[PDB]
Structure formats: structure tokens, C-alpha cells
Amino acid sequence: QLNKQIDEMNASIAKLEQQKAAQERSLAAQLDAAFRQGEHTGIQLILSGEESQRGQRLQAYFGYLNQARQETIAQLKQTREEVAMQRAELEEKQS
Amino acid sequence: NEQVRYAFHGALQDLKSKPFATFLTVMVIAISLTLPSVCYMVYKNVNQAATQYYPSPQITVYLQKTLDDDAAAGVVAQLQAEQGVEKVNYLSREDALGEFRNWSGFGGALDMLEENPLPAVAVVIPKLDFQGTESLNTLRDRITQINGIDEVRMDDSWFARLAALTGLVGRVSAMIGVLMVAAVFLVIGNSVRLSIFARRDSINVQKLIGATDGFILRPFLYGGALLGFSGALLSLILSEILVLRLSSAVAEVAQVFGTKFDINGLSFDECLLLLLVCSMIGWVAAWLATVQHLRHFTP
Amino acid sequence: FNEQVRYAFHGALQDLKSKPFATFLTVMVIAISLTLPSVCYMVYKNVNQAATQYYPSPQITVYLQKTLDDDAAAGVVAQLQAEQGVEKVNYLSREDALGEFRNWSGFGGALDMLEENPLPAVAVVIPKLDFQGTESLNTLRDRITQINGIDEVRMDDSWFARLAALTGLVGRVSAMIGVLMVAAVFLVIGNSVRLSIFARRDSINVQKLIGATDGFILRPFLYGGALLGFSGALLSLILSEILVLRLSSAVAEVAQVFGTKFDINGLSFDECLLLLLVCSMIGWVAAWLATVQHLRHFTP
Amino acid sequence: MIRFEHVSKAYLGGRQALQGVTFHMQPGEMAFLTGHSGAGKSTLLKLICGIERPSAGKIWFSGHDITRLKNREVPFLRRQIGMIFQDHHLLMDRTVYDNVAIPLIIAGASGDDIRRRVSAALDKVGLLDKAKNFPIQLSGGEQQRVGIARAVVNKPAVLLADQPTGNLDDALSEGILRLFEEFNRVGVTVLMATHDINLISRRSYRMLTLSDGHLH
Amino acid sequence: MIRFEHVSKAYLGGRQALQGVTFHMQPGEMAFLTGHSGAGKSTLLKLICGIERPSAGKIWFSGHDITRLKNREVPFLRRQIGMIFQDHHLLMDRTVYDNVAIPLIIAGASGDDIRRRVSAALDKVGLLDKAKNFPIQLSGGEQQRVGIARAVVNKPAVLLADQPTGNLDDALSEGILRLFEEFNRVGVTVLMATHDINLISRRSYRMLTLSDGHLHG
């Protein structure tokens, strides 16, 4: 679509960059978290019920979430190095 | 059975002719009996409070819907092929995304989740008999041999510390309990023996005039049994004062856990057991202080 | 005047040498009654040497806005520890502080598109004990909320006041046991000595009805009570040393699961002589009370 | 019924209290055995009660020899022996009425006849106004008679006494000697021991001496 | 200079031991007060020691007044009282030698003269051989004589005798009565109070009487 394809790709790149931004907020919450986990030997690793198991469930939840971030990178990276390469090749061939 | 009541009506004026001495002897028996009573009530209180508390170590099992959907519900059927586990409650699929967006605070960025690869944990805990050492590690091969899972983790080691700290506390308590019991036995066996040893002349005159073997022991076994009875009764009516002393203090500990805790008092049968034990130990210590003392005056 | 003191001491040991199945029994009762405060005091000293393993109770993590590199974050950290409530803060930051994530927590680095790491460290702040608790927590929140740019004002006191209420419960239960323990020491001697004097009431009678002195009657009984207390405290020290040698093996199992070089540290020499002196004074006071009670009995 | 063969009493101190003594008395007569201070008269009365073993020798009582008897039936012998002692051995913790009424409670008599028997025993010795009292505030003349009133209850077959009338005046010493001679018309063996001679020289039943166990 | 004006003692049981006694005593004077077994024989000695204070009247001893005396002063006026007792007031669970030696220990005597004082006392009484055994293994009649031996040590100024020759024979009674007869050559009074009248019928001394409480003499 010539310039309209580039205009749509700009909005797609903006949405992708916002997904990147949400990804380092996920890693910031993960850090903020991993260090909650922070504790050399003491009392915090016992406490009482519920909330300690909730923290372990949160970090094990992030253990699957951050590797799911890898394939959510890869899913939009499949259309990043191929659609944009074809859009530049189609515009150069028509010109 | 009242033919000779002279013994029971005779072993009271020895305890009433010196009322301050008998009173403060019953004081020391009650004080030395209060420590094992309060220690036993503390032991039974923390034993009752170790039932709904002191949680079992947690085993985390992954049973996600990426592999299969009906197998995640059906794996409950073959996870009973292993003894020791009594709680097999499994959280539903809404719990995983209902807890993450309500406590982690990052539920606003997961609105565009087209596929959800997030698994669920399993609440599988063993009973109290098979706990500690490598008993948790002996059941690894059977859990790893269970199909329908992708991976499993060993995510706890704090329970080994907890059942080393409680083992040390139990060792200290078991060392101190029999030592307090020995303190009670020795304070009965000494606190009455000097009472018979105070009145040697009654033994000498009652033996020197022609009596029988039991008539010498008649006003002394009852005196020792009554002294132990008075000490045990005073200990029971003094331990409840300290129970109501700590009754207000344990209340603030209840609401910081969200529950409500109460004090388990001494029951009727164990109070009668304490009275009978103290009376028989007083009787034995009065017999052993007199039939040994009867052989002195027969050369 | 030392001849009468020597005669009183020799009379006290002449009584204690006679009836060796009775003096030893009285010494054993006093020693078993006194070996409870020794054992609970070794436990009380044992749990106060778990104060280096207890717990930094606030874990406040305050971090400024993004790209807070070099001395810009260090000045904020230095003024964060400039308050009266916080005095020690270790300043770990940048990439080597970030390196604990990849080897400790594992996870995925995602270094292909992470580029610049957005958050090097948070605060690492350890204040001093728990006088900054929830009664005074909102007072110190107002100190740190004045400066802007902080997205890390969160305080989730996961300990809450729990391990507090529990510590107050332990310190109250131990106190109301220990006052009874001290009174049990104060009363077992108080009747062992008193009934020993009551066995020798006829001696006080026959010494009063001849020419005597008011202070001559006291001294053999006072020395007998002092030797009873001294023997009870000495055998209590012996029993407590055997129990320390018994419990030396029991700390070895909890030493492995913590990986620390820990000693029980029982029976220090500054408190053994103090225990002996206090128990000798209790025996002296009990002998004084029993002898004064029996001296006022025989008044005209 | 007292019969003595050649017995020898020696203590653990190696001092021969009685080397050789041999006497025999018919059942139902008095005696007035005396001696010096070093004589063993009171321990001679003590061997009859069986509280002190005769060591080497054979002693006869009624028809049974108290030489190797077990301790289970040692104190069954002294229930029929009304011995008063050197020091007045009393129960100071209880009153004089319960002090006199010890052998009636021992023998198992009914409680209605205990008071009558004790009052009859206290009539002849003269202790009525000082009944239901303790022996602490009784003077030694009264405490010596308390043991006498304890030894004259429930009509003993054999009666022993070592120096009564010691703390007692001569006017009442004669009266309690006729009290002993008031029992000795019903069959009872009386073995009165004493040290004074002036109030026992007015009679003669078995007036015998003792010099380190020797008789004649 | 020991004298009684009109004094008497009441009791917690309501019985009157004395009804008013008036007697005077020079230093170094014998006495042979006697009576029945109900009169105030031993009680009068208990008043004159200071063991029992009178309920009525006031009492003077030596040169002072000893009625209503403080408890801190009555042991200081008992060292010079050599009281013999009726019952054997003796230190049980103690040997004979230190039992006689206790008044020397009260007097603060040294460790060298105490043996030659106590052994001389037990020699003059006649109980030297029984100096290493206990009173529980002594004879009953010679448990009194160690009481006399305890009463005749350290030269008491006033010697009181609550019935000696009680468990003593005929021949030894004049032997122990003649023990007090060289005490009259020095300034010490003796208050012999016996029941039998045979040992006083051959002696001419002061003859006091007690009868129900009335003394006069």
C-alpha cells in the first residue's frame, strides 16, 4: 500500500515498543520481586500460612510468564523481519 | 470402716499445733508442684495449637492445560498411588489468574493474553509420621514417574530447620520434665521426712509400750497423705490464678493470626490423678521415714 | 574471737557429718531445686545468642526515578541513612548487584532486547531493631515521602506484629515461670533449713536455760544453713555442667542445617560465684528466721 | 513368772553391765531390788521386757524363753508388762488423758469404758484437776506419776518399776507403796526397784541387792 | 544479798504455784526447802534463775532487780547461775566432755585450761571414765551426775539444785551432798530441794517448807 503500509507499520512498531515497555515493567516487578525473595536465613521464609505460599506462587508464576515473554517476542518478530523486509522490497521494485 | 479413728483424729493436731509451719510447708509443696503443672499445660496448649498450625512441607506439581485438559482433572485419580498424603485438594483454573491480578499488582498488563501457558500448583502434603530426613526424597522417583507432567521442583528446605529447632526444644523440654518430676518427688520425700524426724519421742514411747507394727504407722501415713493432698489442692487452686493471669496476654496473639485462641484448663480426671499421685508419694515417703526409723529402737 | 567461730563451724560440720543419708538428701533436694534456674538461664542465654540470627525487621526498599547512575543515587542513599532511625546502609548497585538474579533466581536474562537495564538495585536498607514499628512507621513515612521521584514507597511488613506478640508471649510465660522458680529456690531452702533447726529445738532449749549469749545460739545454725546453701549450689553447678556436656551433642544437629559455628556458652565464672553467694545468703537468712522464731518461743 | 538362768548383758562399749545373775520368783510376790549407782538394776528390768537382747544366756518368762524370738511378737510381750521407766517417757505432743489411755487404745477396748478406767486409775494416784492437760506444764513429780497411772491400767500380769517415789514426797510415797500392795492381793508379780532404804525397810518380801550383777 | 518480798506466779491454766513468799538469803547460805509434789519447789528456782518471771510482785537478785528484765540482759545474768534441773536437760547428739565444757565456751576460756577444768569436775563428781560417750548410752542415774558436773564448772556465784540425789543410791547421795559442803567456805549459796528427809535428818542447816504455795519458813 506504499506509504499506507509504512504508516500502518509505524503504528505496529509503536504497539510493539509499548509491548517492550510493558516487558521491562514485568521484569521490574520480577526484580522488585526476586528480592522480596531476598532473604538470608531467618524467619520470613516461615511466617504463617497463605501469604508465603502466595509469594512462592507469584515467583513460580513469573517463572512461566517470563519465558512466555520469549515466544511473545518471537511471534511478533516473525512478522518483523519478514513483513518489513517484503514491504521495503515491494516499494523498491515498484519504484 | 471406722474402728480406729484415733489416727485420723490424731494426725490433725500435729498439723494444727504448728499452723504456720504446716501452712508454709504446704506453700513449698504447692510452689514446687506449680512448675510441672504450668509446664504440662504449656505443653498441651502448644500441642493443641500445633494442630491447626505448624504446616506440612509443600510439594509443587505442574499440571498445565497445554499438554491436556481432561488429564489435569484426571491425574487426581492416580496421585493416590502413594501412601502418606491425606490432603489432595486441587485449585481450579480461575485461581491462577484470580490471585495474580489481585495480589501481584501486574494484572493490568496481561489483558492482551491470547494464549495462557500458566500452570497450576497442587496442594499435596504428607502426614506427620513420615516427615524430615530423606523421607521426602524417597518419594521423588514415583512422582517423577507419574505421567502427564512436564517438570517438578524441590522448593522447600525450611521444614528441615523447623524440625531441628522443634527437636532441640523437645529435647530441652524432655530433659526438664523428668527433672521437675524428680524435684517434686524429692521435695515430698524430704518435706515430710523431717516431720517424722521431728517427733522421734512419739515413735520411741509408742514402740516402748507394747504396740503393734501398724499402730506406730497409723498417725503418720495419714499425716503424709494429708500433707501431699493439701499441697496438691493448693497447687491446683494456684495454677488457675496464673492461667487467668496469662488469659488476657494470649488474646492479642490471636488477632494477629486472624483466629481466636483459648486456654485449655486442667480436666477433672488429671486433677484427681495429681491428687492421688501426691497423696501416694506422701504416703510412701511417710512409710519409708518410719519403718526405717522403727528399726532404730529395736537393738 | 575466732575460736568461737571455729567452734561453731566444727559443730556445724559435726552435725552434717552425722546422718550421712539425711544431710546428703537435704543437699540433693536443694541442689535439684536450684538446678532449674541454672538450666533455664542457660536456655535464656542461648536464645539471646540467636540475636545475630534473629531478624532485620524492616526491609524498606526506596528507589528513585530511572537512569539514577553514579553519585546521583549515592547522594540519595547517603541522605537516606542520615536520619536518626537508620544508621547502617550498604550501597550495592549497578551491574554486579544485578548479577545475583541470573545465578540465584535463574530465570531468563532476555539480553537480546533488554539493552540498558532499567533498575540497578533498589535501596538495601537495614535499620536498627524494631523501635521503628507500626506505631512509628507512618511518622518515618512522612520523612521519606517529601522527596519526589520515588516509585518504591511500598511497605509490606510481612512479619506484622506477629513475631512480636509471640515474643511478648514467650517473655511473659518465661517471666511468670521464672518468678515461681526463684520463689521455689527461696522456699525449698526456707523449709530444709527450718525443719533442720526444728529437729534441734531441744538444743536451743538447753542452751537457753543455762548461761549463754543471744549471738552464740545463732552462729552454728547460721553456718549450717550457709553450708547447706553452698553445697546445694555447688552440686547444682556440677549437675548443670553435666547437662551442658549432655546438650553439647544436641546443638550439633542444628549446626549443620544452619552452617554456623555455635557454642552454648554455659557456666561462666562470673555468675557461678554469684549463684553460690546468693544461695549462701538465702541459707543464712532462713537460718536467721528459724533461729529467731525458736528463740522467741522460749521467752519468759 | 520371772526366772533367770546364767545370762550376761554386755553393751557395744565393752562394759559388763551384768556378768552373772540367777534368781527365781513365784508368780504374785513383791521385790525390792536395790544397789549402788554402777549396778545394772534398770537394764535387768529392761531384759525382762525384751527391749534389750540378753546376748549370751537364757531367760524364762511364764513358759517361753525370750532369747531368739522374732520382732513380730516382741511387742506382744510388753502389753502385759506395766513398766515405768528411768526418765518419764511420755508423749509430749498429746494431752495427759490420751497419754494415760494409750494401752486401752492399743488393746482395743470400747471407748465408753476408756474414760471410766482412766478416771479410776487417776483416782488412786491423785490426778483429777490436772486431767486434759499437757505434760509440758506438769512438774516432774506429776509426770513421774503419769507413767505410773499408765502402767496400772488394764490389770497387767507382771508389773515392773525402776525408782518411783524419786520425785515424790515421803507422805505420798507410802501411799503409792500401799497402792502397789493394793494390786498385790490379786495375782500380779511386782518388781519394784528403788534406791532409798528408809521406806522399804518397814517390809520384807524379796529384799535383795545388786553389786555389778552379783547377788550373794 | 538475794531476797524475796511478796511475789507469786500465775499460770495460763489458772493454777497458782505461789501465794506470796518472803524469805531472805545471805551469801554462802545453805537451803533445804521441801514439800509435797504439788507445791512451789522447782517453780521458785525457775523464778530465781530468771527462766520464769513472776506474775505478781518484784524480785531482786545479787544486787540488782531482775523482774521484767529485757531479753538481751537475761543471758548475762545466767552465767553465774549453776542450775541443776529435775529432768536431765542435756545436749543430746554430743559427747559428755563438751557438754560439760559448754559453760567454759560461754565464758570464753582458752583451749588448754578447759580440759583440766572439765576433767577435774568429772573427777570430783565421780564420772571421769564416762567422758567420751553420749548421754543416750549413759545410765539414767549417772545422767544426773553429769548435770551436777556441768553445774559445778567455772565457779558459779549462786548454785541452784532442783532435786539431786533423785536417781542416786543411798551411799552416793551423801557423797554428792558432801560435794556441796566445801562450797560453803566460799561465797556461793546452795538451794537443795529434796523430797526424802533421811539425808537432812543428820545435818543442821536452814529448813524451809513449801505447802500448796505458802512458804513462810
Ligand SMILES: Nc1ncnc2c1ncn2[C@@H]1O[C@H](COP(=O)(O)OP(=O)(O)OP(=O)(O)O)[C@@H](O)[C@H]1O
Ligand atoms: N545404752 C547404754 N549403752 C552403754 N552402756 C550403757 C547403756 N545403758 C546403761 N549402760 C551402762 O550400764 C551400767 C548400768 O546401767 P543402768 O541403766 O542399769 O543403770 P541404773 O542402775 O539405772 O543406774 P543408777 O543406779 O545410777 O540409777 C553402767 O555402766 C552404764 O554405763
Ligand SMILES: Nc1ncnc2c1ncn2[C@@H]1O[C@H](COP(=O)(O)OP(=O)(O)OP(=O)(O)O)[C@@H](O)[C@H]1O
Ligand atoms: N508452765 C506452767 N504452766 C502451768 N502450770 C504449771 C507450769 N509449770 C508448772 N505448773 C504447775 O504448777 C505447780 C508447780 O509445781 P512445781 O513445778 O513447783 O513442782 P513440784 O510441785 O514441787 O513438783 P516436783 O515433785 O516435780 O518437784 C504444779 O502443779 C505444776 O503442774
